Design a protein around this ligand. Structure first.
Ligand SMILES: Cc1cc2nc3c(=O)[nH]c(=O)nc-3n(C[C@H](O)[C@H](O)[C@H](O)COP(=O)(O)OP(=O)(O)OC[C@H]3O[C@@H](n4cnc5c(N)ncnc54)[C@H](O)[C@@H]3O)c2cc1C
Ligand SMILES: Cc1cc2nc3c(=O)[nH]c(=O)nc-3n(C[C@H](O)[C@H](O)[C@H](O)COP(=O)(O)OP(=O)(O)OC[C@H]3O[C@@H](n4cnc5c(N)ncnc54)[C@H](O)[C@@H]3O)c2cc1C
Ligand SMILES: Cc1cc2nc3c(=O)[nH]c(=O)nc-3n(C[C@H](O)[C@H](O)[C@H](O)COP(=O)(O)OP(=O)(O)OC[C@H]3O[C@@H](n4cnc5c(N)ncnc54)[C@H](O)[C@@H]3O)c2cc1C
Ligand SMILES: Cc1cc2nc3c(=O)[nH]c(=O)nc-3n(C[C@H](O)[C@H](O)[C@H](O)COP(=O)(O)OP(=O)(O)OC[C@H]3O[C@@H](n4cnc5c(N)ncnc54)[C@H](O)[C@@H]3O)c2cc1C
Ligand SMILES: [Cl-]
Ligand SMILES: [Cl-]
Lengths: 383, 383, 383, 383
């Protein structure tokens, strides 16, 4: 039992924090105001190491564990205001790079993986459908086996990075008899005949992180573009979501550390009735809640990632961390706004934008109600 | 003890609801998207009766009580998506029309009141300052008595309607010896020398409801433009805030009724795992919270306004209603977003915009921490 | 819309309050300490009017509506510390007297009803079973039709008043083919062969309100002791629970009014750090929550009972009031303890005992989770 | 960063757990029912090691750190239902043994310390007064210096173990000019002239853990019985409370682990409506809250104790852990009762007694409002 980072981990965190502050946070306000995802800046971040994670040196990666990867992402969330870009980059890492590395054939990895790890190519993960959100294994897109590969039809929605992606990691049914056991995963390139990528659909939350629908109209998928074995697509999706929930969520821990520092400074400086507003217990009690939340969810995050790195079953731990981080990120965003009062409306300071950016954290990679269902199942309550 | 509306009250509510749906809600999505406050549409709403409240027939008003006025505003909040326009109109009524009617001289009312009641003129209330928010009686703007009236200097911030107002109801110290007893109220016209109205300052919440700063540089206020007696400005401000907290807050009760209907319809229609999502208790428990909140805060609102109409001391009741409505409006906005999941990001449906519009309700007219301080004082805990 | 009591209602409340203070609360501390239910005192309360409710003058009652009955019970909850006795009396009224009056034949009412209304006889309602709590229509006790009546077998648990009852209102299946439509209700006398009333089972909550199990071993029920029609027992039980949830819950509104007055007095009188503890916002914020809860749940209670008296469908309103009153009674008990600190441990003052007495309010007459299921069904979420 | 116990720590926990189950939990139900604190059993627990903590081998101790000591206490809280005895023992360790070891002279330690570490003698800590609870440095008891020592007068209340203690660690003012700097600490023996120990005062929470008032009437304290330096009594008290809040609170973490296991088993076994009640999300969502709380507060506890063992400033960490453990212990007690419904009233199972035992955890060693004030001060909000 030890609660210090190693020297190596401290160096990883500090280097990522410096890059986030000195590279990505530069001119963030202009990109945020204009709703710009700068692909050239995204690629520099990818190549720095944010697209690497556990990938081996063979493919340009850093062989990091889950805890190391989470520390880099926590630093990114604390140091850069451009959380939409950070979310886009981390989705590419956790839901696209990592499954290709963990399950792709040698041929597929040799063709695509280093390009994704360096950001030469941007990827999008396409699983969710109009009638398959939480009930993902109800997906209806079909990859019908045929001579030489598959014929793919269907529609995916809510696809982060789709408007800017060069490749798509898609999940579809190769056996409509089954749910989970009937899904396979495939890599398809932008421009393939029959792949219709929709225009960006605007949103107020994470507003410069592009998403859109994609429609498959009779796409031919060559056999060599299947990721993993036939029917393994549910397991591949599940594994990718463990990585996304475990490490991507660290963004919001770093964002909460930043928010709490801003909120503490204001509560010490702003005076009403002849005293700092932090001296009123209505004000300080909320700030203490923010502090309590930050410390608890950071420890839960670190333990979930450490358990994964030890080879232990961390599924419940990752569901608990994803739930706590996202709940605490939203609640603390509300508490920071309450601390500032009318001053919270300022768009430069961005407290309201911060709350908006935290709202989807309770939805992405499985809603928090679904996290409770996962934990309930691990506790024996779904037998 | 009776919980029905009278026939007259039902007619007032239904007429206001029809106007909100059939006039104001028409083309609201375009104005919301473009961040437009249509002054011509605002004036039609004012003249319909939303700028009338308790004003007598002599000045074009309807002699409504607080409960009647709140019902009209509740209908407005349920029927029109353009809550920024509705907030702007209700601020003009509660913080400008009503104090002028209740405290202005015959001469001032004869010159200005009917124009404000018909919306011929738009008014803004200017009390808050950089160093006087919750601690309003710390305001530093000074109206120094001089031959013929006053010399006014100072700065006001967060002033709803300032960029579009023709007249300003301003509060300033006529005696810097005192706080509350040292404030007077004045009506000043747009264009008076020394009145510098700032450009609109954008915000994400209530985004088409304009606000800005105003600076007074050596303005001469003629004696006849003082509203009420010298030093009564604190009492006038206080009375105006009772009306704003009591009736303007009804907007958010009507908005919660609308939100709950939308949320119920979706939870019945959207299916996952082979059933409507409303069949999962994680989903329905939040919707029941929304229902419980709506019923409780509507009754608290109605009782506060009824008590005022009976001539009873309703200050604690109004503080309790303002606190409950705004807390419940924010919490229910969060719960509706959670019900919809990724579907909540759609900008046309506007669930995220609705949450943004509810966030300032816990701040305007006195924060909810200040409402607790008012209630504490009424309960004898601040002696 | 009116929020005053009538003169008649004010008189009912005040007379009940005086009886609760001047009769029942006398020597309550001794009975509470010794865990005594004084049947002679219970009978005086019954005869005063607490066993009357809506029963007609023909049978000794007062023809009160639900709101009148709730006011009497609210006064009882505020004026008497002996809430175990009050709960016992109100269970007899709402679950035994009222169904016999509403559904019993002329012959059964002529034999028993006036005796129950005067408290000459004490009754217990026996519905719950080991395997039928929330799922009450799963009850397994059987009243098998036979020549002359029925043969009754089964076991009931959690039966308030069973150790002191002279008569039992029992629910059992007359058709094991059905659930709700298969239940009938019967009145059986203490001492009937085969009726085995268990010894009192102690509890820490409502500790002097006796309950026990009852076992039926081949009881013969004569035909004339069926209450209502064959198979109407589910409807009779349901109606009785509407009365119990609607009016019995008023006990806890009166108890919260008493608790809040005690808590306010202490927060003004107790000083630490040179000021009354009510001046610290951590302390006052909880007391304001208690006040907000009291006002909201009293209005919800009154509206539910008024709607019933108007002949409107009040089922959702009664479920909402039962849920809010019991949740707020428990939360406010916790908040009063927090206000007093170590002083809350005093057994004479009884703040901890008060919390214990409120704990079962979230369980009796249907748990609060079941109240949410009822409200969900009324909102169309259980179709 | 590592989240495993060492082999030594696992052995400490497991040995303490076995002793708690196989020695202390034996016949606990009888002692709980009769409100008995068995001093002979208490002494066996003390001698086993529960009175040792950090005390050196010289005095019979085990030289444990704070984390080791907390693990032993967590095991005690999980393994023994007799939490009143466990609280009594841990108060003696943390508030009496530890300050004597850390601050007492060689002469005082040689006379008393090994006897306290073996439980040969029981000690009580007497700091709180009628007018000095949270505001402890307002204590009014006076130890007036005189020839040969001090004359002690005053009154202490809420003193755990006073009715059974052989020695008292008392705090009193040696300089009524100052608060914190004016307090000194002393050891006095039962039977000293002028020491009047009150009779046990009963309570419903921790009901077999005796407490009482003590009155000092002109007690002569010889100079050699002062613990530490003159005026160091505030620092000694503060240090003792760090140990009590840091390690004694582990009792409630172990109790929550036990409660959660009991609650999970019931939610799997109890069926209504044809399924285990754990399958209803209203039920499982609360159990998941219990699980989330247990994991978070155990990690916060372990980190606070580890930081203390590393020589770091752990004051904020200990205040955060004491607050979270006690809040989560109370909330989880409420949630377990809600899970069981009417079955929670059973006195043998003791769910209601468990809630009662957790209620004072939010008060002892400083209320949770005071913990927030400590954290606020550490965050710079009390400057
Ligand atoms: C920012 C963001 C980025 C995203 N990026 C991607 C991406 O790149 N690729 C991709 O494939 N998808 C992506 N998604 C989609 C995401 O996976 C879905 O939003 C998620 O699976 C939830 O599905 P849904 O939104 O359809 O909600 P629904 O499943 O319709 O849920 C609606 C409500 O019902 C509740 N509910 C549903 N089932 C249950 C149940 N069994 N028990 C209890 N409650 C239940 C939910 O918790 C929620 O409250 C993204 C979403 C967001 C918000
Ligand atoms: C939508 C909107 C419209 C507005 N329109 C107008 C307008 O037209 N005219 C106008 O004059 N003003 C207007 N205002 C300003 C409004 O009156 C102020 O925002 C309000 O008075 C709060 O002051 P503040 O924002 O400076 O917050 P502060 O007073 O700085 O409060 C900051 C924090 O400290 C807390 N706090 C302060 N004092 C205490 C205390 N004693 N106890 C406990 N907590 C305390 C607050 O509750 C809050 O959490 C508007 C504001 C909003 C949001
Ligand atoms: C003070 C008191 C007095 C009583 N007096 C009487 C009396 O005089 N006569 C009598 O007949 N009975 C009486 N009862 C019993 C009472 O009716 C039952 O306690 C009640 O019906 C709940 O059943 P249960 O206790 O078996 O809990 P269970 O039904 O076992 O419930 C256990 C848990 O599962 C939850 N749960 C169950 N089903 C669902 C569902 N569908 N959805 C979500 N959650 C669910 C519950 O809410 C609870 O959290 C009394 C109870 C109390 C506490
Ligand atoms: C189980 C138990 C065992 C105990 N054992 C001992 C023992 O052995 N020896 C001993 O000396 N004492 C003991 N105590 C007493 C304990 O130290 C006091 O209860 C504690 O210091 C709180 O003081 P109080 O109870 O007088 O509450 P008060 O100080 O009167 O507090 C009342 C309320 O005011 C609040 N409050 C007070 N000041 C502030 C503030 N500045 N800001 C915000 N809120 C504030 C509190 O949080 C609380 O809500 C024990 C108490 C308990 C419950
Ligand atoms: Cl305060
Ligand atoms: Cl469910």
């Amino acid at each position: 039992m030890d609660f210090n980072l190693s020297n190596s981990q401290s160096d990883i965190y500090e280097s990522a924090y410096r890059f986030a502050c000195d590279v990505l946070d530069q001119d963030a306000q202009t990109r945020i105001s204009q709703k710009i995802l700068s692909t050239e800046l995204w690629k520099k971040a990818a190549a720095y190491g944010f697209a690497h994670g556990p990938v081996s040196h063979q493919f340009g990666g850093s062989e990091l564990g889950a805890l190391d990867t989470a520390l880099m992402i926590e630093a990114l969330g604390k140091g850069s205001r451009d959380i939409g870009l950070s979310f886009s980059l981390c989705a590419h890492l956790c839901a696209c790079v990592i499954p290709l590395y963990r399950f792709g054939s040698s041929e597929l990895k040799d063709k695509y993986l280093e390009s994704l790890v360096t950001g030469k190519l941007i990827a999008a993960n396409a699983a969710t459908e109009p009638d398959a959100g939480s009930d993902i294994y109800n997906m209806q897109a079909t990859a019908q086996p045929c001579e030489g590969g598959y014929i793919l039809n269907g529609k995916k929605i809510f696809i982060t990075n789709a408007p800017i992606a060069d490749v798509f990691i898609i999940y579809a049914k190769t056996n409509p008899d089954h749910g989970f056991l009937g899904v396979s995963a495939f890599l398809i390139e932008k421009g393939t005949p029959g792949l219709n990528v929709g225009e960006v659909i605007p949103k107020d939350c994470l507003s410069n992180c592009p998403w859109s629908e994609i429609v498959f109209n009779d796409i031919f998928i060559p056999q060599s573009q299947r990721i993993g074995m036939e029917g393994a697509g549910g397991a591949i999706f599940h594994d990718s979501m463990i990585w996304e929930k475990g490490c991507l969520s660290a963004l919001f821990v770093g964002g909460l550390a930043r928010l709490l520092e801003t909120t503490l400074e204001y509560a010490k400086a702003r005076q009403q009735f002849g005293k700092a507003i932090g001296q009123f217990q209505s004000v300080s009690n909320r700030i203490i809640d923010m502090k309590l939340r930050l410390e608890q969810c950071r420890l839960m995050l670190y333990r979930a990632c450490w358990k994964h790195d030890q080879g232990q079953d961390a599924e419940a731990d990752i569901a608990m961390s994803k739930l706590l981080i996202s709940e605490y990120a939203v609640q603390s965003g509300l508490d920071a706004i309450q601390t500032f009062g009318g001053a919270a409306m300022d768009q430069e300071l961005g407290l309201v934008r911060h709350l908006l950016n935290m709202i989807p954290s309770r939805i992405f990679s499985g809603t928090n109600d679904i996290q409770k269902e996962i934990i309930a199942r691990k506790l024996g309550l779904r037998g």
